[PDB]
């Protein structure tokens, strides 16, 4: 059976992760769970955001699902995990959901590298001048390009756009662009197009339907993904994954927010669980989960963040029920 490590994290995480677990069990898949701790609240009790035991648990499982995160000695749990486990592929999908305030027809995935697994981009200040290093290496570019190509090859469109800034940064961005295009020769089935990041941002706003998979570098991926989230309902419903060569951690994009009341929308956590299923090779199960979520978002109840007043537990129940009817 699949071993899934569950980490609630802080605040709303305590509500959306158990919800995600519920939906996962509803799929009927042979699943096992291992609870672990991480985050600010874990720091206050353990002295560290990511206890050594947590890393061990993560490594003992096929995949990890993380809820949310919210001083000397403290460090970002997710940032630490990316570096410690070299989860180099940051995967952020943007898909139209049947919710008021969402552009229809949008269905893309943005892939960018999590650099710290290989190196930390250093900042330095000398008197009145501060300098930040933007680093691109052939190795890192080959890895993320191959990761993006595989993702595109597993999607209907078989289309990949390389969003770059080689026009103004020929050495760094050019190395990125050229390397991804080189790796692309190994994926003749994938249609690869190059696009300046600025133009990509404008086209995401004007006609996002144009994109399927987009691969880009660090700082650019961030803004493009947030721009895209703005088009389909905000970060509130956005799932994400951090995939390495041995394991992966999935989590909602938005912070830990409210909370405690039980009005947190578990959509992102559930869709992150769906991303995890896809990653594990259970694509059909992932599609059913996603469908069930859409059905509820469309007809079923709705949590506060979506105009409704339904509770996290109520919304989750509907999904479970809907999932069972599919």
User: Could you tell me the maximum CA-CA distance found in the chain, to the nearest angstrom?
Assistant: 65
265 in a known ligand binding site: yes
305 in a known ligand binding site: no
Taking alpha carbons only, the member of 80, 97, 96, 137 closest to residue 113 is 137
Residue 10 annotated as catalytic:
no
Among 32, 35, 104, 134, indicate the residue that binds a copy of itself (CB under 8 A).
Answer: 134
Residue 212 annotated as catalytic:
no
**What's the CA gap between 323 and 293, in Å, rounded?**
8
281 in a known ligand binding site: no
Give the shortest CB-5-to-a copy of itself separation in angstroms: 26
- Residue 105 binding a copy of itself, by CB under 8 A: no
Taking alpha carbons only, the member of 204, 188, 110, 186 closest to residue 148 is 110
Taking alpha carbons only, the member of 38, 229, 220, 7 closest to residue 115 is 220
Closest to a copy of itself by CB, 255 vs 308, is 255
Find the catalytic residue in 158, 178, 226, 287: 226
- Residue 136 binding a copy of itself, by CB under 8 A: yes
C-beta neighbour count of 9 within 10 angstroms: 27
Among 32, 56, 138, 284, indicate the residue that binds a copy of itself (CB under 8 A).
Answer: 138
Residue 198 annotated as catalytic:
yes
Per-residue x/- marks for a copy of itself, 158-177, CB under 8 A?
A: -------x---xxxxxxx--
Closest to a copy of itself by CB, 66 vs 176, is 176
Residue 138 annotated as catalytic:
no
Taking alpha carbons only, the member of 275, 248, 177 closest to residue 217 is 177
273, two tokens: 């669980």
Q: Tell which positions 43-62 bind a copy of itself, by CB under 8 A.
A: none
- Residue 139 binding a copy of itself, by CB under 8 A: yes
Residue 104 burial (10 A CB sphere; 0-12, 13-18, 19+): exposed
167 in a known ligand binding site: yes
In the block, residue with structure tokens 């919304």: 315
C-beta neighbour count of 82 within 10 angstroms: 22
222, two tokens: 């961030």
**What's the CA gap between 240 and 253, in Å, rounded?**
6
Among 227, 287, 291, 311, indicate the residue that binds a copy of itself (CB under 8 A).
Answer: 227
Closest to a copy of itself by CB, 165 vs 288, is 165
**What's the CA gap between 190 and 312, in Å, rounded?**
40
79 in a known ligand binding site: yes
Find the catalytic residue in 10, 57, 95, 165: 165
**Sign of the C-alpha dihedral, residues 201, 203, 206, 208?**
negative
- Residue 223 binding a copy of itself, by CB under 8 A: yes
- Residue 71 binding a copy of itself, by CB under 8 A: no
Q: Mind telling me the catalytic residues?
A: 119, 165, 198, 222, 226
Residue ranges for the known binding site for (2R,3S)-homoisocitrate are 79, 82, 92, 112, 119, 165, 167
Residues that bind a copy of itself (CB under 8 A): 101, 118-119, 122-139, 165, 169-175, 197-199, 201-206, 219-220, 222-227, 229-231, 234-235
């Amino acid at each position: 059976a699949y071993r899934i490590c569950l980490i609630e994290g802080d605040g709303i995480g305590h509500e959306v992760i158990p919800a995600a677990r519920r939906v996962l069990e509803a799929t009927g898949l042979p699943l096992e769970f291992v609870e672990a701790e991480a985050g600010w609240e874990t720091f206050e009790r353990r002295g560290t955001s990511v206890p050594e035991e947590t890393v061990e648990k993560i490594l003992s499982c096929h995949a990890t699902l993380f809820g949310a995160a919210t001083v000397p000695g403290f460090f970002g749990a997710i940032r630490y995990l990316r570096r410690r486990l070299d989860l180099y592929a940051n995967v952020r999908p943007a898909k139209s959901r049947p919710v008021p305030g969402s552009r229809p027809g949008v269905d893309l995935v943005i892939v960018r590298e999590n650099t710290e697994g290989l190196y930390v981009e250093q900042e330095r200040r000398y008197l009145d001048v501060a300098i930040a290093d933007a680093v691109i290496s052939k190795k890192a570019s080959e890895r993320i390009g191959r990761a993006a190509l595989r993702i595109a090859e597993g999607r209907p469109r078989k289309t990949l756009h390389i969003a770059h800034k080689a026009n103004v940064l020929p050495l760094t961005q050019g190395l990125f662009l050229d390397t991804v295009k080189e790796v692309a020769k190994d994926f003749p089935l994938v249609n690869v197009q190059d696009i300046i990041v600025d133009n990509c941002a404008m086209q995401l706003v004007m006609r996002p339907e144009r994109f399927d998979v987009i691969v880009t570098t660090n700082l650019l991926g961030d803004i493009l993904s947030d721009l895209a989230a703005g088009l389909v309902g905000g970060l509130g419903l956005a799932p994400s994954g951090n995939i390495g060569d041995t394991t992966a951690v999935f989590e909602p994009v938005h912070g830990s927010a409210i909370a405690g009341k039980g009005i947190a929308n578990p959509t992102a956590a559930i869709l992150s669980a769906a991303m995890m299923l896809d990653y594990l090779g259970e694509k059909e199960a992932a599609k059913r989960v996603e469908k069930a979520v859409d059905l509820v978002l469309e007809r079923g109840p709705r949590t506060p963040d979506l105009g409704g007043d339904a509770t996290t537990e109520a919304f989750t129940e509907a999904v479970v029920e809907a999932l069972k009817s599919l």
